[PDB]
Amino acid sequence: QYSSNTQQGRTSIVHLFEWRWVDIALECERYLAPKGFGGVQVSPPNENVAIHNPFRPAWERYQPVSYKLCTRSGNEDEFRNMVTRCNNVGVRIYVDAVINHMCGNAVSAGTSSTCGSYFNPGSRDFPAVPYSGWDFNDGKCKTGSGDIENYNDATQVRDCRLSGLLDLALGKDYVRSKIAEYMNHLIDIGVAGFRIDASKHMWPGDIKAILDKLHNLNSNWFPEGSKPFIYQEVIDLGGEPIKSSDYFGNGRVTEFKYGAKLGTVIRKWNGEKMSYLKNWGEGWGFMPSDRALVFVDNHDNQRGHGAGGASILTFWDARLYKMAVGFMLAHPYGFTRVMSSYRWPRYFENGKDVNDWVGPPNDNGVTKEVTINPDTTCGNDWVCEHRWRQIRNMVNFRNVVDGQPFTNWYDNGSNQVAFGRGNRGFIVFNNDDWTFSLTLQTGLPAGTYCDVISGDKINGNCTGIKIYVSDDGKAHFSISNSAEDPFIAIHAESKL
Numbered sequence: 336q337y338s339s340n341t342q343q344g345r346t347s348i349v350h351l352f353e354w355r356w357v358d359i360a361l362e363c364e365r366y367l368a369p370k371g372f373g374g375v376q377v378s379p380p381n382e383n384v385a386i387h388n389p390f391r392p393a394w395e396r397y398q399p400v401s402y403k404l405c406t407r408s409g410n411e412d413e414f415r416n417m418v419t420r421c422n423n424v425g426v427r428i429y430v431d432a433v434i435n436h437m438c439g440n441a442v443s444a445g446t447s448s449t450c451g452s453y454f455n456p457g458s459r460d461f462p463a464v465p466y467s468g469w470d471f472n473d474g475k476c477k478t479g480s481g482d483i484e485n486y487n488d489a490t491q492v493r494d495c496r497l498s499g500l501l502d503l504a505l506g507k508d509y510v511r512s513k514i515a516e517y518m519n520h521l522i523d524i525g526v527a528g529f530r531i532d533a534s535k536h537m538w539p540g541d542i543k544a545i546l547d548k549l550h551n552l553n554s555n556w557f558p559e560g561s562k563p564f565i566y567q568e569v570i571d572l573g574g575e576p577i578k579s580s581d582y583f584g585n586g587r588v589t590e591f592k593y594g595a596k597l598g599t600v601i602r603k604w605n606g607e608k609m610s611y612l613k614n615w616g617e618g619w620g621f622m623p624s625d626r627a628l629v630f631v632d633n634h635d636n637q638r639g640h641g642a643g644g645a646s647i648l649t650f651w652d653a654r655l656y657k658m659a660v661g662f663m664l665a666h667p668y669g670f671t672r673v674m675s676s677y678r679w680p681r682y683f684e685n686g687k688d689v690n691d692w693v694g695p696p697n698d699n700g701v702t703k704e705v706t707i708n709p710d711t712t713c714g715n716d717w718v719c720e721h722r723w724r725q726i727r728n729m730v731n732f733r734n735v736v737d738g739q740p741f742t743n744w745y746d747n748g749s750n751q752v753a754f755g756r757g758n759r760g761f762i763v764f765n766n767d768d769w770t771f772s773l774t775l776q777t778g779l780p781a782g783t784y785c786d787v788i789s790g791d792k793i794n795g796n797c798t799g800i801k802i803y804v805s806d807d808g809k810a811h812f813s814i815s816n817s818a819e820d821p822f823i824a825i826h827a828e829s830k831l
């Protein structure tokens with residue numbers, strides 16, 4: 336469950352949040368494969384409640400109606416088409432698996448669902464599965480409301496309804512088997528692994544019992560005995576009875592400490608400075624690197640949901656965001672996930688984004704296609720951070736330096752830092768209010784290297800900055816504090 340199952344020399348996954356299957360399939364072929372992306376985390380592919388108030392929110396996808404592969408992202412044919420086409424170009428699919436719960440207990444009965452399946456939350460009837468009243472935790476939960484009231488109580492966090500979401504009885508073999516059926520369907524199609532949604536809300540032992548029932552990965556694409564990559568969503572910043580480590584037996588775990596702390600550092604809040612990143616990783620109290628799924632922001636905290644707080648960096652803060660993502664992708668700690676977002680009409684009323692619910696770009700609820708602008712950015716309000724040169728090139732930086740040790744660290748005691756990865760890559764940051772101008776040991780072979788932040792190598796030349804490494808590995812770097820991208824990165828494959 337710990338191995339990503341990505342192609343050798345591909346080290347990141349990108350969350351193509353709310354993208355349609357046909358768009359992802361094309362994206363794999365035209366972009367993700369040639370740019371060296373390891374894989375795609377997709378939005379939940381299973382049927383959900385069509386919520387009309389508010390109008391088709393992002394969060395409707397986290398209210399299951401059945402396990403039919405039928406969503407705003409597309410139908411089963413399109414899903415199968417996407418996984419095949421992506422695997423065929425060496426790009427993996429990871430499914431957002433919503434298995435803790437069905438929909439909200441107060442959602443109306445009917446066929447307001449993405450495939451038109453009937454469901455009745457009040458009577459606990461989901462006949463397209465099927466689930467009945469016997470399949471939920473109503474009798475197991477011990478709170479007055481039936482919902483989670485207190486995170487200091489590990490039991491109710493597991494047995495009670497998250498925000499009123501009907502809590503599946505995962506202690507039952509029937510329920511475990513229905514979920515395993517869904518996941519095995521996905522595995523056989525060719526899915527490489529799963530983001531396990533709301534993992535904190537399930538007993539580690541129940542997740543395990545579900546995982547016990549799963550097939551090995553599709554043997555046309557994956558070596559015999561390959562197990563699905565598992566990464567579990569557990570928000571653990573400390574101070575709760577449930578710990579990220581409780582889930583290590585099942586796979587990797589999201590390290591939410593990662594983006595919270597990095598955001599604070601890059602913003603220079605709370606007295607934090609980039610020089611403090613010298614011991615980034617386990618030295619910052621983070622989980623073991625071999626279990627961490629790391630990211631700057633995710634689909635929840637980029638809009639203030641879940642954990643996060645104000646420190647989280649997102650596309651809205653493009654300049655600091657790129658630096659934070661650049662730092663993540665250069666540093667060996669964790670397995671990296673890059674966010675890919677859509678723009679929504681962000682509108683604050685007393686410190687709250689009243690539009691944090693808004694779903695993907697749409698015309699009357701129909702998800703808009705991802706259009707590609709001439710310059711390879713996206714139209715239709717898709718942000719496509721993964722296509723921003725500064726991020727895409729850092730994705731390849733991580734591939735190039737894979738397995739190389741953190742080395743040649745420099746800092747000025749403030750916010751000017753640099754480090755290398757073995758003899759394969761070097762990166763330099765200026766987050767101070769003055770110019771960073773200095774000759775530094777890069778650990779790299781002598782030569783002319785294209786800075787992959789400002790530009791690209793195109794056979795024999797660079798479209799941006801050029802860095803000159805002399806015979807002793809030293810190179811001069813000059814980064815103004817006024818630089819729009821106040822960092823530079825060079826690696827073995829950017830050498831002329």
Ligand SMILES: C[C@H]1O[C@H](O[C@H]2[C@H](O)[C@@H](O)[C@@H](O)O[C@@H]2CO)[C@H](O)[C@@H](O)[C@@H]1N[C@H]1C=C(CO)[C@@H](O)[C@H](O)[C@H]1O
Pocket residue numbers: 394397398433486532533534535568570571575635640641642
């Ligand atoms: C959105 C988020 O809610 C929960 O998170 C809480 C943390 O667990 C607490 O430690 C504390 O920080 O408060 C948080 C906010 O309530 C929950 O535990 C997470 O699992 C949840 N995230 C996902 C689950 C969903 C339900 O399917 C979705 O709404 C959401 O998009 C998921 O990413």
Ligand SMILES: OC[C@H]1O[C@H](O)[C@H](O)[C@@H](O)[C@@H]1O
Pocket residue numbers: 606611
């Ligand atoms: O500002 C606080 C920091 O000061 C010190 O320089 C330590 O290296 C670091 O661990 C500590 O957190």
Ligand SMILES: [Ca+2]
Pocket residue numbers: 435492493494495502503536537
């Ligand atoms: Ca539960």
Ligand SMILES: [Cl-]
Pocket residue numbers: 530568589633
């Ligand atoms: Cl997540």
